[PDB]
Design a protein around this nucleic acid. Structure first.
Length: 137
RNA sequence: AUGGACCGCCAGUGAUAAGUGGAAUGCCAUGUGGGCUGUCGAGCCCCACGCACGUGGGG
């Protein structure tokens, strides 16, 4: 929230919503001027999408200790089809969704991290299931 | 008023140059169209004349 002078805007986050320079033609016209704010629930949906698939293009810059490279990387599984098996209810389906964690270091997710990530440095590896479920960072 | 409403795929362009289908070839040999046969009274009207048998002029 600090170190970022310009807000990206709701239209840049949500998918199917024409961001600032996009051509506005399809997916509802949004002039990026007085944009109708998304409800929080749909905001969570678009959020989860962006953490998964996300534009690999350069975006809003963030100076971090003197370094501003508005360049942004690509999503971790950008452009692939995920396969989740189902049952008759969400219960047994979610249970079959659990991948077998190989024996290794205990791991924790991004939303389970007691530490706030430092942008610089190496994203350390993670043998735990939270690192092979692509939710460590 | 519909995963919809609004909405160009589009600006340019020789298919070009050349070329015998050519040499030879009888549809030939045979055949009645025949018998019968003469072309010899309604015609519609007006008028004139008449011996009322018909005669004559005009359409």
């Amino acid at each position: 929230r600090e170190e970022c002078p310009k807000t990206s805007g709701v239209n840049k986050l949500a998918w199917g919503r024409t961001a600032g320079e996009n051509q506005v033609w399809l997916g509802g016209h949004h002039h990026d001027l007085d944009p109708h704010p998304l409800d929080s629930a749909e905001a969570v949906w678009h959020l989860l999408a962006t953490l998964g698939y996300g534009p690999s293009g350069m975006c809003t810059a963030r100076v971090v200790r003197g370094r501003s490279e508005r360049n942004v990387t690509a999503g971790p599984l950008r452009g692939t089809v995920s396969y989740h098996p189902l049952g008759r209810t969400l219960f047994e389906s979610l249970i079959l969704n659990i991948p077998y964690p190989g024996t290794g270091a205990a791991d924790l997710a991004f939303w389970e991290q007691p530490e706030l990530n430092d942008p610089l440095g190496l994203p350390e590896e993670s043998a735990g299931l939270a690192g092979i479920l692509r939710l460590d960072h």
